[PDB]
Structure formats: C-alpha cells, structure tokens
Design a protein around this nucleic acid. Structure first.
Lengths: 167, 69, 266, 158
RNA sequence: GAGUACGACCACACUUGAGUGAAAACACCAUAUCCCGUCCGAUUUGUGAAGUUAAGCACUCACAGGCUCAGUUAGUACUGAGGUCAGUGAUGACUCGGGAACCCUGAGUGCCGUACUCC
RNA sequence: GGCUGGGGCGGCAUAUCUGUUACACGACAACGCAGGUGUCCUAAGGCGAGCUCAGUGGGAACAGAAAUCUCACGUAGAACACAAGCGUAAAAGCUUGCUUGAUUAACGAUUUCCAGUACGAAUCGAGACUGCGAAAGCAAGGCCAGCGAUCCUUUGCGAAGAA
RNA sequence: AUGAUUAGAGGGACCUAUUCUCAAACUUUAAAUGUGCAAACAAACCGUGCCUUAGCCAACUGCAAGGCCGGAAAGAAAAGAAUUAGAGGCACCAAGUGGGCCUUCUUCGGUAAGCGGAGCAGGCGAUGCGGAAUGAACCGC
C-alpha cells in the first residue's frame, strides 16, 4: 500500500549567515540571485550578543528558498560538491539533509573581483504529497503519524538516487 | 488625642429605626428622558394622536348621552 | 521534558468545534450575526459563499439560537440543467450561482417579478438601494477577499439578480486601485468566461481534458453562459432531474481475558 | 481595598471561571431584550467597555431604555434610610434575561389551562395528597442500632 | 445508513497509538495564460479533474491519559443558634440545625437544528 | 500648616491607583502589609488583512550554551509604555497597509465618591463631518491611577452679502 | 496551575512516576451564615379584536410603542405550601449629638496589657430593680 506516498523533495532552502551588514551582505545577496535565480529575503537579528559582535536588527544573514525543478538540479549541483557522500549524523529526525559547501565557486558561477568567496548552507525538506493538510488556512489539521517521513526513509531516499553514506 | 476614629457601630440600628423604605413602584416614575430618542420621538408622535382620539370620544359621549336623554 | 504531562490535559480548555475543525471564523460571524438591539428580532439574512473545489455553494441563511436556517440554496453543480457543462468552479459559474440564488429567493419570498436587476450584465457598479430591495450580507468565510476572487463573483451574481448586497466595486476583477475606477470591460470578460475562452485557444491531455474531449470551441463560450443566464431567469427551480460499538461488559470481559491469558504464561 | 478605585475590589468577582474562558457566545448576541423585561446583571469580563459597577454584578431589575449596543436597568440600591432606584447603562453582554418571574407565570398558565379544562370537564388529574398523613408501615427489613466496639477503632485513624 | 454547507451547547466532542471506510461527497491532487499575491503558485489567487484513500475527515478500538455524571470519602472537616457547659490553659465535646473537597471505585466517551445530496 | 500611641525630629497614612487585611453581595480601621501616581505616545491612537507567541526538541559551511535557515511540538508558561489585578490565540499580542473618531457632539441620561453636591475618571446614547473595511461592523484616544472653584488675566466663535 | 518544600526509588546532573510539609497578598473544588428579584386589583395571562406611528423589516397585518374593546379572574387550588399588636404613602419646621466605652463571635499591630484598631449584633452611656458578699457593662429582668 504505497500509491501516493513516494517521497519527493519539497523545498531546498539556502542560507548564508554573515555576522555583519553592509557590502559583504549586499554582495552575498548577489551571490544567491546569480545562483538560485530568485531575489532573496535577508534575515535580521533577533537579539544582541556582544561576543559574536551582533546587535539587534542588524541584517545578519541572507537566505533563499528553492522549489521544483530549480531545487533538484541545484541539489545535484551542490550534492556533487561533497561527492554524494555525507554522514548519517546529518539526518534530522524529520528526514532532512544538510551540506557544508564552503565555496560557492564550487557551485559553477564565475568569480567577480568584488564579492569574493562565501560559505553556503543547503538544507533539504523531504515530504509526501499529502502535507498541504497542515498549511491550508481552512480546515487545517495534523498530517497523521503513518504519513510522516522517517529519518530512515529519508536515508534510503538518498541512497536510492546518488547512493552512499557514512556513519 | 487621637481623633481619627471610624465606626459603623450604631448605624444599621438607626437606618432601620424609621425602617428602610422599600422602592418606588414601576408605574410611579417613568419619565423617560434617558432615552433612546428615535423611539422616544415615535412614542410622542402617537401619544399626540391618542389625545385627539380620546378627546373626540369625550364629544361623542356628550352627544350620545343627550341623545339618549 | 514532556509537556503533554498528565496535568496539561487537566487544565486544557478546548476551542469550539467549528474552531477545532477550522470551519468558522468566530470573531467574524459574531460580528455579522449581531444587530442593533432596537431592531428586536428583525430578520437579518446573509448570503454565504463557500467554494469547495469541484463545486460552489451559495446559501441565504437566517441565523437563530437553535441553529442557522437556510431560506434557499444554490449550487454550481446544478448549472448543467441550464446548459453549463464544464468548469463549474470558475468565475463564470460563480456568477451564475447567486444569479440562481438571487432569482430563486425572489420567487421564494414572492417578490418575484417586482425586483429584477440588470439583464445585460454589462457589469458595472451601482449603489445598492420606491420599495427598498431585499437585502442580504455577503459572508466570505475564511477566503482572503483578494480582488478578482470568485467569492465576489457570486456577489454581483446576486446583485444582478435583484438582491441588495451592500458592497463597493473594490474587489471585482478589472479594478485599477491606482485610479479608483472599475473597468467594466475586463470585469465582463471575466464574467462570461472570456478569460477561460482565451486560455483554451492558447492550449490547443490533462489540462482542459474534458473541454477538448467534449469538443467545446473557445468561441462558443461567451455565448454558452449567456444562454444559461437567460435560462436561469426563466426557470429558477429547475435542477438535476430526479460498525457496532462494544458494550460495557465486552470492553471489561475482553480485558480480564487478555490479562489472564498472559497471566497464565508465567 | 486600599485605593477605592472604580473596579477596586475585584480579582475574583470579575475573573472568569476555570476552563470557562472565552469571548461571549452567539446565543447571547441573538437574545433580544424588550423594555419592561426582567434581567440579571452579570458582568462578563471578556468585554472591556460597558461593564456595570462592582455593586450591580448579580442584581436583577426591569430594563427600561434599549439602545443599539446598550440596555439600561432599574436596580434597587438600599441607602441610609431608603432604597434609591438606580438606573445603570450596560452593554447587554453583561445582561441575561432572568428566570425569576418564571414559576409564577407558569402558575398562571397552569391555572388557566386548568380552568378551560374544567369548563367542559374532561374531568381533571387527581389531587396529590400529603405524605405526612397516617399509615401503617410494613417493614421489609429491620436492623438494630447500637454503638459497636468496632466503631471506636474506626474513629482513631491512622 | 451516511456526506457536504451553515450552525447551537462547547472535551461524553479533546490527546496519543493502532484498525476499518459501500455510493456520493469532501479532500489530497495536476497546473500557473488571465485576476491576484509572495524570496518560493508553500500559504494564497486563477484556470481543471489526470491519479489516490496514503494523509485530513467519518467510524471502531485501548483493564490508555483527560473530561462528564453518580458513588465513596462522610454526616468526618467546617458552620448558624445555646450554656452560671468541661478545661489553668490550648481547645473541646454536647444540644436545635445546615453540611463540604481531593485521592479512591463504578459507569459513560457527544448531542441537537435548518438546507441540499448519496443508498 | 496638619495628621501623630505626649510634642519635636522622621514619615505621608494630606489628593490618589492594584493586591491583601476584609470575615464567599456591597460597606469596613490602624504611623497594618506589598507596591504605584503628578508622567509617557502622530503612534504606543483608528481600522482592515495576514500571521503566532515564551520555550523545547531533531537537523544545517565557519557556528560554540548562545547568530541565521528548516521541521515538529507548544492553553499563553510571551506580550499588551508603566505598579498590580483582571481579560485576550485565525487576538486585545506580532508584522503590515491606509489613515486622524485624540475633532465637532443641539445644556440627553447614568454610574463611581456621595449629602445621592461638585471635581476627576467612566458607561449608554442622538446630530454633523469622517476613517479603515468587499461587507457586517469597529472608532469620539491609549479600558480601568495620570488631576483643578469663585475672582483676575488670556485666546477662540458671532466672515462678506442680502432684508 | 502559580509559589514554597523533605526523602528514597526507577531510567553526578537530568528524565519519569511517587513521597514528607505549606500559603493573607495561591488555587481545580467549595460550604454554614448571607444577598438581588419574583409570588394575581395602575399588574400579569388570553384574542385569527381594532385604532395610530416620520420605529423595525422585505414585509404588512410579523415584531416596537401609546391606547381602545372584548375574555377570564382556585383574587390564588392541591402538594407541610406562610405569619403579623401589617393603616401604606408624602411634607414642613426644628432641637440635642457629631470625645464614647464594654461584651459573645469574627478580627489586625503587639511578648503582652484594665493596650491600640476594625466587622455583625447586644448592652452601659441615659436605668434602676432582683442575683453573683462587693463591681457601669456579667446573670435574671
């Protein structure tokens, strides 16, 4: 009994954290548009720190969300960086992934003697097709336990296509 | 001298010595000046026409009496 | 750690069933149902438009304590009787429903031919109100009231049917908002389905599979609804032809058997 | 009460009961109030504007003015030697039609329905008699009252 | 016997883990020219109907948590009236009367309207 | 000046607001207890829409207890200018949009304190012109402490035109 | 739940279920005594009654109001199913007082007080008389 419940990749969320606002943030905001082809929304700061060197509402990070065909081909383009090998330490209990990607140059975009080289953060959300039930405004209710994606089932899903893992 | 004393002591004995007079009946004071006005207007616009009709009955009972005898 | 602690359910207060089910917006209808207390029991109706994908529902509902009561109810799925065989959920049908509801209630209440409303549906905005027309509020529900939304299509389906529903031509499709004026043209095109009639011609397996298979020409559409409009106005009332529980002993008996079963193994 | 404010004495009178919290229900919006009708003034705490004063909570009177969102009520407030008859202005969320007058107006109906029932008989239901009048008792079981030796060790627990 | 739309009382309705769901519905769903809205057609908005009961929803289940009602706790605690009552006191019993609460046990696990529809 | 466990010194119990004393309506004293007030806000007022908060747990380049992204849980454990209480979860909180109902309001009534006087604050209205909203509706400030007689000074309304 | 708080156990801290002990400024629950109203004569109840409206509404002879005209009226049965030295109501003018004190019960500050401060009542003050040998207030009256 598995008609609709095959796993798919719902969203790939990119995150770039920068402990400062200004140029390097405005630059990285351009590093995403070149890459994920969407104008990003930039985070602000939730609180002051004084060690990290961040105050509140400083515009720390610039992140973007990616869905659909852009997301698979960009997943591949970023999953090839680490050579389709990653650590099972990196699988959420909800069935999601993460990648270091210290160099966005490794992601295929030509360098500009302005921006420089940034660290990227890819994070993937795997879910079955029935999960609108938890979002839609009217008659919103829980997804149900049987239908959630397990930490294991997301491992196999990753070992079905572009295999391999380490513990 | 400490002059700041406060007591309720003898009071409800005085308040009941002429008794606590019960309320005034509903019919006695109505005097609706509060009041929700567009209903108050439409009440006097009738209360005039009840005067004509009732003061007319005063005349029809003058004739009908002298008519009888 | 565990926040579902035994004492959590103990002090937990439940929201209303229609709130748990996510069906009704209670801060809303509580404001819609209310009325001046000087109007004592004076009947106050509201037309509720609830669009369930594959269908549309437009009802006229008096609200009272024992429960709401429905004067008349129109459905998108009753349109095929009137000649609309495809796309029952679109804006064009959303207009017909509520033109069906408006004309079916005015026959219901006996008003009948006294109030008619524009037959050309050369859609335009007019102020709502010698006799004053039948008045009903529009009840959106949880829909977002974005301009163009179908819920407000039913709105001018009723208005064009003679019911007086207070509104402003703000959320109808074809409205600038850069200039305060509504463009009746773009709004008409949306009414008779030109937005659909243009998007078939742009297609010609899955999308519009029933349109193509049933062979509707994109040119026939603005005439298909137009006949259905004048058909609704003629005949309003035409529609589509034609585990047992365990008892208190069984729950307990099955339990003492289940324990003695595993109490005999050790 | 230290400060003698407007709503100075109440963290309880104005608090909602446990797990009864919420905004006022529909059924109290769809009640309608006619002038002359008796009413309970019980302040709901989930509506800020329109509350009656701390004294009037829990009283009953005759509504007199009725305004679109308001009512008004005539309540008896005893003062030094006399009862003033007070007129207060409340938002009707705080108002509930009283059942006080009820059993009486039901005694009046069950008289008239009684009377039209005798008019041409059909007879009438029988008149219930006293329970205090006489009788022989036929006991099915009889027991002894005594103070038991055992009754004392039950009263010293432990 | 059910579904949907609106609802009244707002846990006997909730919460968790399982199981089963006739038809019609509901929904998931496919899609993004047009109206419209976002970083993302995710939410949303517009078009439609290829697929699935997997999930929501309905139902059943659990010596389940909670909640409802009744027992018990107990005529105990407390308390209105009384004494030229006991006691050094602290307090207590008594006399004419009202009279609780949790734990604990058993039993229940929604109900009631308007409108349209399915066998 | 006054109150004052003699007066003085100190204090403020002098006008005042929340909890408690306070005895399950209301009322109730002390130099009784624990704290507040003389301000602050064109947004922190008005409204519509969308959203959910404190925190916890899994996971993500640097990145750690603590940055940002993501998912799940989350009966309010947050927030609402401030003392305290009360109330609020598709909001009364948060974000955002448009705004000036923080104006005028014919001498309306009523509550609170109470002599049923005034002041302060508040509730219910009717009229004008409005705001936001598709609409029902909401708003005459930020609920409830944040304040002022006679006399005197001072400003505003009683434009022009017509009879 | 919020705030205090002792101990062992189960899976150094933690987590889970218990455990000893508490709250004027805590509370799910929640009395006794209380408190608001109602209990038939300017009222209420009944009617395919009628008149009037610049009130409500998509109705319209529905609902609001002031009436009018008819109806009935154990004048409030039965069920424990009230009682009364129950004439109700309004007004004018004016004195004295505005230092109180004692007590059952509740009660706050104080180690306590024939101390200071309140609540519901009863007394002395203003009042003797009989009784507790004597005592303002106790007991009887």
């Amino acid at each position: 009994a598995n008609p609709m419940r095959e796993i798919v990749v719902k969203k790939l969320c990119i995150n770039i954290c920068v402990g400062e606002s200004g140029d390097r943030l405005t630059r990285a905001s351009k590093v995403l548009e070149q890459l994920c082809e969407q104008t990003p929304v930039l985070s602000r700061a939730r609180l002051t720190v004084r060690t990290f060197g961040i105050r509140r509402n400083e515009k720390i990070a610039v992140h973007c969300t990616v869905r659909g065909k852009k997301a698979e081909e960009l997943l591949e383009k970023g999953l090839k960086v680490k050579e389709f090998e990653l650590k099972s330490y990196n699988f959420s209990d909800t069935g999601s992934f993460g990648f270091g990607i210290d160099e966005h140059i490794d992601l295929g975009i030509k360098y500009d003697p302005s921006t420089g080289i940034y660290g990227m953060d890819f994070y993937v959300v795997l879910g079955r097709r029935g999960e609108r039930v938890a979002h839609r405004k009217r008659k919103c209710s829980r997804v149900g336990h049987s239908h959630h994606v397990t930490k294991e089932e997301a491992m196999k899903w990753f070992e079905k296509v572009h295999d391999g893992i380490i513990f | 001298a400490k002059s700041k004393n406060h007591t309720n002591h003898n009071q409800s004995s005085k308040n009941h010595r002429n008794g606590i007079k019960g309320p005034v009946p509903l019919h006695l004071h109505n005097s609706k000046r509060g009041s929700w006005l567009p209903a108050l207007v439409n009440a006097r616009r009738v209360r005039k026409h009840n005067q004509k009709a009732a003061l007319k009955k005063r005349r029809e009972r003058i004739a009908a009496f002298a008519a009888k005898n | 750690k565990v926040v579902k602690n035994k004492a959590y359910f103990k002090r937990f207060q439940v929201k209303y069933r229609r709130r748990r089910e996510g069906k009704t917006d209670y801060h809303a209808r509580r404001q819609m149902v209310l009325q001046d207390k000087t109007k004592f029991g004076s009947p106050k109706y509201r037309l509720v438009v609830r669009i369930t994908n594959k269908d549309i529902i437009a009802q006229i509902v008096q609200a009272k304590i024992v429960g709401d009561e429905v004067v008349m109810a129109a459905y998108a799925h009753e349109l095929p009787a009137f000649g609309i065989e495809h796309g029952l959920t679109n804006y064009a049908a959303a207009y017909a429903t509520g033109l069906l509801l408006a004309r079916r209630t005015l026959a219901k209440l006996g008003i009948a031919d006294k109030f008619q409303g524009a037959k050309e549906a050369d859609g335009s905005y007019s102020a709502v109100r010698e006799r004053f027309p039948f008045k009903a509020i529009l009840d959106v529900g949880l829909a977002r009231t974005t301009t163009g939304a179908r819920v407000f299509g039913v709105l001018k389906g009723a208005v064009d049917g003679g019911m007086a529903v207070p509104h402003r031509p703000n959320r109808f499709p074809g409205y600038n908002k850069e200039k305060s004026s509504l463009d009746a043209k773009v709004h008409r095109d949306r009414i008779f389905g030109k937005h659909v009639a243009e998007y078939l011609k742009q297609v010609k397996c899955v999308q519009f599979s029933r349109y193509m298979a049933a062979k509707v020409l994109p040119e026939s559409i603005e005439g298909m609804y137009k006949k259905a409009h004048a058909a609704i106005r003629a005949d309003p009332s035409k529609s589509l032809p034609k585990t047992k529980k365990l008892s208190g002993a069984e729950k307990r008996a099955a339990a003492k058997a289940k324990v003695a079963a595993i109490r005999e193994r050790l | 009460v230290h400060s003698y404010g407007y709503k100075s004495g109440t963290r309880h009178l104005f608090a909602k009961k446990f797990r009864k919290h919420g905004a006022p229900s529909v059924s109290t919006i769809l009640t309608n109030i006619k002038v002359g009708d008796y009413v309970d003034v019980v302040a709901d705490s989930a509506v800020r504007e329109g509350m009656p004063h701390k004294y009037y909570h829990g009283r009953t009177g005759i509504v007199w003015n009725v305004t679109p969102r308001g009512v008004g009520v005539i309540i008896n407030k005893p003062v030094r030697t006399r009862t003033l008859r007070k007129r207060i202005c409340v938002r009707f969320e705080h108002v509930r039609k009283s059942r006080c007058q009820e059993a009486f107006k039901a005694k009046e109906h069950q008289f008239q329905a009684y009377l039209a029932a005798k008019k041409a008989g059909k007879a009438l239901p029988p008149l219930k008699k006293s329970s205090r009048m006489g009788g022989i008792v036929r006991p099915k079981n009889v027991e002894v009252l005594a103070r038991r030796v055992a009754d004392y060790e039950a009263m010293v627990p432990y």
